[PDB]
Amino acid sequence: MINAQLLQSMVDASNDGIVVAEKEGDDTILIYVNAAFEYLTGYSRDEILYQDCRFLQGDDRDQLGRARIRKAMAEGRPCREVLRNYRKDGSAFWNELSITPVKSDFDQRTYFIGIQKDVSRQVELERELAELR
């Protein structure tokens, strides 16, 4: 059978980054991040917790994704967007983000699960198939 520890081990085994955030006003702040997230972003858990994830956009602040993300957050609906993001050292990567609202039965509160997929290679590839044709 399955127990709690193995669930955690499943989350730690994950390649895609996985985070949990809670909504405070128009900030959605990080209460959990896995190791995949740390290697993808180059940030440790201890630096980044209790802050909104928008910092990964660095100073690239005009992304349509942002607006749609916010709307979905308001409506308590899942969304998937592709953003340009930037690691700690400043390196750039393409991030397909999935946000799933889930209401926790403990405090009856809605939490947001992010899942970050690194799509950078695919980005540069379809950009090449398109540009050649």
Q: Which residues are annotated as a binding site for FMN?
A: 52-54, 57, 61, 66, 70, 85, 95, 116
Contact 10, 36 (CB under 8 A): no
Instruction: Report if residue 126 touches its own copies, rule: CB under 8 A.
Output: yes
If you write DSSP's letter for every residue of 66-111 in order, what string do you get?
A: HHHHHHHHHTT--EEEEEEEE-TTS-EEEEEEEEEEEEETTTTEEE
Structure tokens at 10: 């499943």
Q: Which does 91 bind (CB under 5 to 8 A by kind): ligand FMN, its own copies, none?
A: none
Sign, Cα dihedral of 56, 104, 101, 26: negative
- Out of 1, 62, 75, 90, name the contact with its own copies by CB under 8 A: 1
**Interface with its own copies: number of residues (CB under 8 A):** 39
Q: Is 48 in the site for ligand FMN (CB under 6 A)?
A: no
Select the binding partner of residue 47 from ligand FMN, its own copies, none (C-beta < 5 to 8 A, by kind).
none
Contact stretch for its own copies (CB under 8 A) within 57-65, 69-77, 83-91, 103-111: 103-111
> Nearest 5°: phi and psi at 66?
-50, -50
By the rule CB under 8 A, 105 interacts with its own copies: yes
DSSP letter assigned to residue 128: H
Six token digits for residue 93: 């990567």
Positions in the binding site for ligand FMN (CB under 6 A): 19, 21, 28, 52-54, 56-57, 66, 69-70, 73, 83, 85, 95, 97, 99, 112-114, 116
